[PDB]
Design a protein around this ligand. Structure first.
Ligand SMILES: CC[C@H]1CN2CCc3cc(OC)c(OC)cc3[C@@H]2C[C@@H]1C[C@H]1NCCc2cc(O)c(OC)cc21
Ligand SMILES: [Mg+2]
Ligand SMILES: [Mg+2]
Ligand SMILES: [Mg+2]
Ligand SMILES: [Mg+2]
Ligand SMILES: [Mg+2]
Ligand SMILES: [Mg+2]
Ligand SMILES: [Mg+2]
Ligand SMILES: [Mg+2]
Ligand SMILES: [Mg+2]
Ligand SMILES: [Mg+2]
Ligand SMILES: [Mg+2]
Ligand SMILES: [Mg+2]
Ligand SMILES: [Mg+2]
Ligand SMILES: [Mg+2]
Ligand SMILES: [Mg+2]
Ligand SMILES: [Mg+2]
Ligand SMILES: [Mg+2]
Ligand SMILES: [Mg+2]
Ligand SMILES: [Mg+2]
Ligand SMILES: [Mg+2]
Ligand SMILES: [Mg+2]
Ligand SMILES: [Mg+2]
Ligand SMILES: [Mg+2]
Ligand SMILES: [Mg+2]
Ligand SMILES: [Mg+2]
Ligand SMILES: [Mg+2]
Ligand SMILES: [Mg+2]
Ligand SMILES: [Mg+2]
Ligand SMILES: [Mg+2]
Ligand SMILES: [Mg+2]
Ligand SMILES: [Mg+2]
Ligand SMILES: [Mg+2]
Ligand SMILES: [Mg+2]
Ligand SMILES: [Mg+2]
Ligand SMILES: [Mg+2]
Ligand SMILES: [Mg+2]
Ligand SMILES: [Mg+2]
Ligand SMILES: [Mg+2]
Ligand SMILES: [Mg+2]
Ligand SMILES: [Mg+2]
Ligand SMILES: [Mg+2]
Ligand SMILES: [Mg+2]
Ligand SMILES: [Mg+2]
Ligand SMILES: [Mg+2]
Ligand SMILES: [Mg+2]
Ligand SMILES: [Mg+2]
Ligand SMILES: [Mg+2]
Ligand SMILES: [Mg+2]
Ligand SMILES: [Mg+2]
Ligand SMILES: [Mg+2]
Ligand SMILES: [Mg+2]
Ligand SMILES: [Mg+2]
Ligand SMILES: [Mg+2]
Ligand SMILES: [Mg+2]
Ligand SMILES: [Mg+2]
Ligand SMILES: [Mg+2]
Ligand SMILES: [Mg+2]
Ligand SMILES: [Mg+2]
Ligand SMILES: [Mg+2]
Ligand SMILES: [Mg+2]
Ligand SMILES: [Mg+2]
Ligand SMILES: [Mg+2]
Ligand SMILES: [Mg+2]
Ligand SMILES: [Mg+2]
Ligand SMILES: [Mg+2]
Ligand SMILES: [Mg+2]
Ligand SMILES: [Mg+2]
Ligand SMILES: [Mg+2]
Ligand SMILES: [Mg+2]
Ligand SMILES: [Mg+2]
Ligand SMILES: [Mg+2]
Ligand SMILES: [Mg+2]
Ligand SMILES: [Mg+2]
Ligand SMILES: [Mg+2]
Ligand SMILES: [Mg+2]
Ligand SMILES: [Mg+2]
Ligand SMILES: [Mg+2]
Ligand SMILES: [Mg+2]
Ligand SMILES: [Mg+2]
Ligand SMILES: [Mg+2]
Ligand SMILES: [Mg+2]
Ligand SMILES: [Mg+2]
Ligand SMILES: [Mg+2]
Ligand SMILES: [Mg+2]
Ligand SMILES: [Mg+2]
Ligand SMILES: [Mg+2]
Ligand SMILES: [Mg+2]
Ligand SMILES: [Mg+2]
Ligand SMILES: [Mg+2]
Ligand SMILES: [Mg+2]
Ligand SMILES: [Mg+2]
Ligand SMILES: [Mg+2]
Ligand SMILES: [Mg+2]
Ligand SMILES: [Mg+2]
Ligand SMILES: [Mg+2]
Ligand SMILES: [Mg+2]
Ligand SMILES: [Zn+2]
Lengths: 249, 91
RNA sequence: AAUAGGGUGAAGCCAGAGGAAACUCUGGUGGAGGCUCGUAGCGGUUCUGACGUGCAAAUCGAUCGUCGAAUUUGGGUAUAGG
RNA sequence: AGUGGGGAAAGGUUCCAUGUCAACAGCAGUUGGACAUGGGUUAGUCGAUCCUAAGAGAUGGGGAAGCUCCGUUUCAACGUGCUUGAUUUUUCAGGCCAACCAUCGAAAGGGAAUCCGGUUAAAAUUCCGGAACUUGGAUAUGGAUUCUUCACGGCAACGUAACUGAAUGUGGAGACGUCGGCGUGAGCCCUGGGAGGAGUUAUCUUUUCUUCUUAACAGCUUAUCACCCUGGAAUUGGUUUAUCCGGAGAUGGGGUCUUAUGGCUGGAAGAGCGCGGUAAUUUUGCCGCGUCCGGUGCGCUUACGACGGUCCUUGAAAAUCCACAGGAAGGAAUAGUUUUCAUGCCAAGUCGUACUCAUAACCGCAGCAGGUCUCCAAGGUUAACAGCCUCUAGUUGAUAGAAUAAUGUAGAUAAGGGAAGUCGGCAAAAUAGAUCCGUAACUUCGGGAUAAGGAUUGGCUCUAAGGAUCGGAACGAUCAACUUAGAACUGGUACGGACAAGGGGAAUCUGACUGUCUAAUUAAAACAUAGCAUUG
RNA sequence: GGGUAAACGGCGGGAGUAACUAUGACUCUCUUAAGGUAGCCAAAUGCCUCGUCAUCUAAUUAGUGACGCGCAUGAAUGGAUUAACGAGAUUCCCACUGUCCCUAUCUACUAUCUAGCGAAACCACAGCCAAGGGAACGGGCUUGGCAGAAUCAGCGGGGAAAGAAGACCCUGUUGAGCUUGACUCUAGUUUGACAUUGUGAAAAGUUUUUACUUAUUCAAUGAAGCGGAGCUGGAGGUCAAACUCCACGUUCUAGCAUUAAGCC
RNA sequence: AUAACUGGCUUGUGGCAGUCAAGCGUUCAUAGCGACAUUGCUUUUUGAUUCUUCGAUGUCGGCUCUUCCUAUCAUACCGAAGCAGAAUUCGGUAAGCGUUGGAUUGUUCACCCACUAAUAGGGAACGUGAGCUGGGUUUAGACCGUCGUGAGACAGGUUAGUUU
RNA sequence: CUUGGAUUUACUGAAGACUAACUACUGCGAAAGCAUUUACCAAGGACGUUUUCAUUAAUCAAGAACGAAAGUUAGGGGAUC
C-alpha cells in the first residue's frame, strides 16, 4: 500500500502550523529573584486576539530590575483583566485575579490558570479559554501541591510552581454551532491543515486500512493495539471500551 | 412592525442548518451583539471585539470576558471565591 | 490583484394604534445572508450537435452550472517516486 | 470588458531605412515578422540595486564509512566594534555598549528625489529647452540667539524663519481585512453666451461638427474629524440616509489643529491650440488676431473622508525616518553658537531601456479558431460596463472565379391533429422586461413565491405632485433633476413592436443545504460539510 | 479471569388450539451469545415476479397508494421522516410544438465545374455473377451464365474493407496492483541480561527498599542574587543567657526610576 | 491446440407431416378426430461437437429498405361435411397481391386496447452499426442486498458512462 | 464477592445526595410547597395606634404570574435508590 495521512503529518511539510499572524508565545515571566522572594508589579497595556487561539492574550509591561528597560510579557488573559490593571507576580503577591503566585501561597479551592508543571517552565496547564486548575491541597513537608486539571486528572506539582489567579477568558466558545463548512475553513485557516477530513473507509486499500470493499465498511475491529506500528494506528487506539457512554465513569 | 415572529437575528440564515441549531445560535448571538454597561464609566457602551475582548467606546477600557458575554457565571463564581479566600487569608 | 446591473429584505432604530399588566398590532427606516436573477469570470450539463487523416493529440457551436465567497487568479515558496 | 492605446512573463533584433523575390508566406506577390546591407535602445529622480516575507542556507557544534545530514544562535572566549578630545608625540587617552544581528529570498509587498513643451526613419519621465527636487559632502554670508546664557507669544487647544542636548530609554511613522450606504474632489459626460473654422441650405435649421488648454514645483489661503476656552442643561436637548451624544459637561458663543481636497498667485504664455496673411528649388519659417465668462447632476470612473455592519476568521515583517524622556558635555560682552532659518558651492557610479505581448513576434512541431497576468474606457437606447447602432483609434486580414443537382452543415417556415414519434418530449417550440392585481398544499415560520393565475404597455397634446438659494415669509424673486400619477385624442387592436428575456403544476426515489473530484468517455445518489458519537 | 457493540460484527431451527368455516390470542427445547425490537418495504434492497388489491389509461412488465413468514429490510455497518435546495433517477397533467401522421418549401456554406496549390489511409496479385467441392460462407479452382474502349456525379451490398501481434477466454512452471488466520522475513516497539556504573545503610536470601553526588539524563537564563552564617526587629515565658521560629525597604491611581549622592 | 457469435456435420430436443386403426363422433373406425404403436421431414428452438476465425469477421433490440420461401392468415377459383340458409370446419391449385394503429417492457418473446379482407409463419452471416440509434449487455465512478476476516464475488437490483 | 484475604475492625480521605432524633391534630406560604448554622437582599400576616387618605371596594369573560412528580433539549454532576 501507500503511506497514510497519519504518517504524512510527521514530516510537517504542509502540516506545520500557520503562525504568521500569531502574537507571540504566551508565557509567564522567567522565574527570577523578585518573584522568588517578593513581588514585581506590571501594568496591562493590551488585551488582544491571538489568531488560532480562543483565549485573548494580555500584553503586560514590567520594569527590568537590573537595567533601565521595559519588559513586555505575553500572558494569557484571565477573565476580568482589564487594560491599565496592575498585575503582581511573586511569592508575596496578593490573591487577586490576574496575579501570578506560587501554588503553595494559594489556599485550597483557589482557581488558578496557566499553571506550571515544573518550576520555571512558564505555564503548561489550563491555558485554553474557559479552563482553569483547582488547587486541591498542600503537603508542606514534601513541598507538594495537589491540583485538579481541566480533564479531571489529579496532579502533584511543586509548591514553587506558579499560576495566574482566575479563569482563562473567552469561555463558552463551543456553545455556539459553527453551522457552516466555511466557518470551519476559516477556523483552521489560521491553525493548520487538518480540515476537511476524508473518511478512511471512503478510500482505497492503498490509502488507508479502512479502504476498499464493495460496501464502505471497516471490516476488522477499529480498536487498535497500543503496540501496533505506524500505518496501523488508524481508528480507536488502545481503546479501553467503546460505544455510547452510559452511566458514570 | 414586527418583521419575524421568532428567528430574530437568525433570519439571515434563511431556512438552512436546522431550526434547533438556528435557535441555539440566536441565543448566543443576541448576547454577543448586545451592548453592556461599562463597570468603569457607567455607560452602556461596551461591545465585543473578538472573542473574550470587550471594549468600551466611551472610556476606551478593554476587559477580558467570555466568548459571547462580558462575564461568564464561572468567572463571577471565581471572583467571589477568590474574594472570600482573600478575606480569610488576610483576616 | 479581480468580481455590471437587479430582486429579496435579517438585526438595530423612528413614529402611530391598542392594553391594567405581562405585552401586542401597523407604517417607515435600515441593509443581513457560504440568499437569489443575471454579466465579466470560473466550470463543463445536454445536443450522446459539429469535427473526428480536426482549427485542435480534447477544439468549435448552441444549451447549461455557479457568479461576494469552502470565490477566481499572477508571482514567490514548500512537499519527490513505494 | 475594442480588431484602440500600454505593460508583466516569454521571445531576441522580429524595430527603422534601403534594396530585394531562389526558398518561405499550403493561391499570388512588385508586398512581408522572409532574404541582403546598414542604422537604432542616452536616467542622480523609471526600475534593478537595498529590506524583510513564506522560505533557503553558511559558521560553532553534533551525526554519518562517506557522498553529506541536522541545526540557525543552537552546551561558542563569536566587535575586520562605534563615539569623542586628539596627537602631529603618525604615538594616543579613554567613554560606552556587544539581548538580536553570516548571507540569500519580491522588476505586483516595503522604499529618498521630475515635470511640462519640443525633437527621430526608428530612442525618450532618459535627448533638447525651460522649470524643479532628493541624498551625500563641503562651507561662508545674512538672519536668529546670549550680559536673566541655550527665543518668544497664547488662559488654553497651540503658534513661529530659526530658537544647545551625549550615553541610554520610551513612543510614532513604515504598517496593512472585507462589505454597505452617504459626503467631497478630480477626470470624463451634458449644457448657455462670446470669439474663430468646417458642413447642410429646393425648403427648414440664431443650425450640425469642431478650438477656447495649463504639468511637477513655491507661497498664501482652504476641512470633515479631533481638541481648547466660556457655560451649566428635564418642559431633556443636539443630531445622521443609517440613533448616537451630553454633569466623565450637551445645546449656545468663541477659538486651535491635520491640508486630504479645492481657490488665488508664481511656474505661464514666452508653451500648446484655433484662425487669417504671406516667404520659398528653398535648411525651415515670418507676421497678425484670438485663446474668454459661465451652468448643471440619485450621471460614470476613481481617490479621499466621516461612519456603520461582519468573524469560534480580527485581517505581514524588516530596512529606514522622526519626535519625545534624560541631563553628559560645551558654552557670552568686546564678544560668544548653529548648517532642523534663508541663500550660496560640488557630486550622484553600475546594469536594463529598440520592438511584439498575440486569430503572425510567447507556449502548443506552424504565421495553429487552443492557452497565457493586468491598467485606461465616448454618445444613444437601457436597470445595465448586457445586447443593438455610432464617434476617436484601428482593420477591411482569412485562395479566388462560375454555377446553384443530390446528400450534408448552420438556420428558417408550415394546413389539420398535438407526443400517436421515441428507451425516454432527445431536439425544437411555448414563457419571458416593467406596472398593477392575485397567489395553494406543506413548513425547520425563515420560506415555498416570479407559486399558480390575470390585466395593461405605442405615439401625441396636456394636467398634477415631489425642490434649492435669496428677501423681515401660509408670501415674493430667481434657478433647477428626472421620477411618479391621472386625462383627452389617435391608429388595419398595434405598442418590453428589433434587442433583450422564467414554461408551469401533482407526486415518488435519493443526497439536508452552499461546496468538491475521475485534465482527455462517468458531476452522481460519490467526496466534503455543519451536527452527533466514540478513542488516546 | 474481568470489561467493552456510536469495536468488527450478529440478531435462527423445532414441537399444539376458539359453541359453521377461516385464522390462531394460548408453552418449553437446541445451536459458541442473543435470537430482528421501534420502524420501513416487491423500496436503488423480493428470487419466485409482469407478487396480490386499488388507482391512474381505451389498453400500463411503467407510476403512485396499500399488503407483507421480508430468497436476502432494520436502527451512527445508523432506522424512520423531512421544509428548502438539485444540469441527480422516475410517473402523470396543462401549455407547446414537424417528435410523428407526411412530408414540402426557402437562405448561406459546401459538395459541383474552373485557375493555382496539393496530402494521407491503404496496396500478395487483383477485382462480374450462380452452383459445386474446398480449412465446412471464393475474385482466382471446377461447371455454367456471360463478356466491347475511355469514363463523370452519387452510393454505402461486398472487398469475412481500414484502424490495433483480442482488452473477453484458456495456456505459460510470465508479471504486477491489492488482501489475509498463506510460506519466509523485517523497520519499529516491548521485555530480560551484560556494559556504561560509582559511594553508604538496613533487611531479606544473591534479592527488596532508600541515603549520597561526581558519571549520565532533563530544563532555563544576556549563567543576578544559590548554600551557610551574621546584622535588625516581632514573638515563646524567659528560669541563665539569650536558645528556637518568623520577617527583614515596592499594593487606592494606565506617572517617574538609567550615566550614586552622602560619609570616612 | 481452447470457450463466449455466425457458418458446417447431427437432429436427441423443439417444430411440422405420414401409415395402422382400438376408440370418439345419436348409429357409424376414417365428415371431423384418433389411443397403443410405427415411418419420416425441417433447420424458424435448444443441445451435442470444437472444423474455421483470438497479428479482432463490431457481440441485443428497434428504426429503415429490398428480396426470397411456403408449412396460405386474407384475397381468386374450386372439392368435402355430422354443407337447408347464414356462419363454420376439412381439403386442392395457388406466394399474383396484401398482412395495421397503439398502452406497458431495452427487450427478442409477451400481453391487452382498437381497426381491418387479414392482422400467417419464416430466411437472407440468428439480413441490415464506415445505415442510424445506444434503451440493454459488457471496462473504468457510485449505491444496495446476500456472500467473504479481507482485498473482493454475484451469470441479482440500481444510476452515470467518446459509436472512428 | 471470597486464602489473589472477602465480610469484619480502627484511623484517614473523596464524592455526590439528604437534613434523622427534636417533629406535635404545631408554624409559614396564593397554591404547588417549605426543616442544619450564619450573613446579606427584598417581601409578609397578625397585633398595637386618640397616625394618614376618604369609597379608592367584592367577584370577575378577555388576558396574565406561579404551578408536586414524571417527561423533553443542552451543559455539569453522577454517592444512593
Ligand atoms: C455574410 C455573413 C452571414 C451570411 N448569411 C447569409 C444568410 C444566412 C441565413 C441563415 O439562416 C436563415 C443562417 O443561419 C445561421 C446563416 C446565414 C449566413 C451567415 C453568415 C455569418 C455567419 N457565418 C457562420 C458563423 C458566424 C459567426 C459569427 O461570429 C458571425 O459574426 C459576424 C457571423 C457568422
Ligand atoms: Mg469531521
Ligand atoms: Mg469526513
Ligand atoms: Mg472509491
Ligand atoms: Mg492494507
Ligand atoms: Mg487491519
Ligand atoms: Mg474496507
Ligand atoms: Mg465503492
Ligand atoms: Mg456507508
Ligand atoms: Mg461482513
Ligand atoms: Mg448508576
Ligand atoms: Mg450564492
Ligand atoms: Mg444563483
Ligand atoms: Mg463546450
Ligand atoms: Mg458527439
Ligand atoms: Mg468527415
Ligand atoms: Mg499561484
Ligand atoms: Mg459591449
Ligand atoms: Mg496590449
Ligand atoms: Mg517592419
Ligand atoms: Mg504560396
Ligand atoms: Mg510564387
Ligand atoms: Mg531576417
Ligand atoms: Mg526610484
Ligand atoms: Mg525565517
Ligand atoms: Mg544546512
Ligand atoms: Mg561545521
Ligand atoms: Mg537581498
Ligand atoms: Mg521591489
Ligand atoms: Mg503590506
Ligand atoms: Mg515630454
Ligand atoms: Mg517608441
Ligand atoms: Mg534637460
Ligand atoms: Mg465605501
Ligand atoms: Mg464631478
Ligand atoms: Mg512629483
Ligand atoms: Mg499662471
Ligand atoms: Mg471594520
Ligand atoms: Mg519602449
Ligand atoms: Mg493564439
Ligand atoms: Mg469568412
Ligand atoms: Mg403543422
Ligand atoms: Mg396552425
Ligand atoms: Mg392540444
Ligand atoms: Mg411520447
Ligand atoms: Mg408513446
Ligand atoms: Mg410506439
Ligand atoms: Mg416505453
Ligand atoms: Mg431540451
Ligand atoms: Mg406569475
Ligand atoms: Mg448535494
Ligand atoms: Mg472525465
Ligand atoms: Mg484516468
Ligand atoms: Mg461529462
Ligand atoms: Mg424477522
Ligand atoms: Mg418486525
Ligand atoms: Mg418486502
Ligand atoms: Mg408501505
Ligand atoms: Mg425495484
Ligand atoms: Mg404495474
Ligand atoms: Mg407512459
Ligand atoms: Mg408500491
Ligand atoms: Mg440484514
Ligand atoms: Mg444494512
Ligand atoms: Mg450544487
Ligand atoms: Mg487477401
Ligand atoms: Mg459467388
Ligand atoms: Mg459449402
Ligand atoms: Mg478475397
Ligand atoms: Mg469459367
Ligand atoms: Mg459515403
Ligand atoms: Mg461495404
Ligand atoms: Mg495475440
Ligand atoms: Mg507446464
Ligand atoms: Mg499494477
Ligand atoms: Mg428432429
Ligand atoms: Mg421430435
Ligand atoms: Mg466453434
Ligand atoms: Mg477470435
Ligand atoms: Mg475489421
Ligand atoms: Mg465487415
Ligand atoms: Mg402449397
Ligand atoms: Mg385455402
Ligand atoms: Mg445479425
Ligand atoms: Mg454493414
Ligand atoms: Mg458504427
Ligand atoms: Mg445493430
Ligand atoms: Mg461500470
Ligand atoms: Mg452524465
Ligand atoms: Mg446505465
Ligand atoms: Mg448506457
Ligand atoms: Mg437536623
Ligand atoms: Mg415552630
Ligand atoms: Mg390564599
Ligand atoms: Mg364576570
Ligand atoms: Mg380566564
Ligand atoms: Mg444531562
Ligand atoms: Zn466605559
Amino acid at each position: 500500500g501507500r503511506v497514510i495521512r497519519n504518517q504524512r503529518k510527521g514530516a510537517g511539510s504542509i502540516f506545520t502550523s500557520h503562525t504568521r499572524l500569531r502574537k507571540g508565545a504566551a508565557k509567564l515571566r522567567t522565574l527570577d529573584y523578585a518573584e522568588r522572594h517578593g513581588y514585581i508589579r506590571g501594568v496591562v497595556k493590551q488585551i488582544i486576539h491571538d489568531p488560532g487561539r480562543g483565549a485573548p492574550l494580555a500584553k503586560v509591561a514590567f520594569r527590568d530590575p537590573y537595567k533601565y528597560k521595559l519588559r513586555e510579557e505575553t500572558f494569557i488573559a484571565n477573565e476580568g483583566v482589564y487594560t491599565g490593571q496592575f498585575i503582581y507576580a511573586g511569592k508575596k503577591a496578593s490573591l487577586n485575579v490576574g496575579n501570578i503566585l506560587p501554588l503553595g501561597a494559594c489556599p485550597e479551592g483557589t482557581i488558578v490558570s496557566n499553571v506550571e508543571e515544573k518550576v520555571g517552565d512558564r505555564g503548561a496547564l489550563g491555558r485554553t479559554s474557559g479552563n482553569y486548575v483547582i488547587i486541591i491541597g498542600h503537603n508542606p513537608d514534601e513541598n507538594k501541591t495537589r491540583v485538579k486539571l481541566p480533564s479531571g486528572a489529579k496532579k502533584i506539582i511543586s509548591s514553587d510552581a506558579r499560576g495566574v489567579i482566575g479563569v482563562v477568558a473567552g469561555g463558552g466558545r463551543i456553545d455556539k454551532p459553527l453551522l457552516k463548512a466555511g466557518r470551519a475553513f476559516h477556523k483552521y485557516k489560521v491553525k493548520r491543515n487538518s480540515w476537511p477530513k476524508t473518511r478512511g473507509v471512503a478510500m482505497n486499500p492503498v490509502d488507508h486500512p479502512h479502504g476498499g470493499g464493495n460496501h464502505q465498511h471497516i471490516g476488522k475491529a477499529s480498536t487498535i493495539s497500543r503496540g501496533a506500528v505506524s500505518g496501523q494506528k488508524a481508528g480507536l487506539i488502545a481503546a479501553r471500551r467503546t460505544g455510547l457512554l452510559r452511566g458514570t465513569q | 412592525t414586527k418583521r419575524t415572529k421568532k428567528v430574530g437575528i437568525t433570519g439571515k440564515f434563511g431556512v438552512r442548518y436546522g431550526s434547533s441549531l438556528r435557535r441555539q445560535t440566536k441565543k448566543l448571538e443576541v448576547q454577543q451583539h448586545a451592548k453592556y454597561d461599562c463597570s468603569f464609566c457607567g455607560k452602556r457602551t461596551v461591545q465585543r471585539g473578538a472573542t473574550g475582548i470587550w471594549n468600551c467606546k466611551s472610556c476606551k477600557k478593554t476587559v477580558a470576558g467570555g466568548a459571547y458575554t462580558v462575564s461568564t457565571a464561572a468567572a463571577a463564581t471565581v471572583r467571589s471565591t477568590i474574594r472570600r479566600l482573600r478575606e480569610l487569608a488576610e483576616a
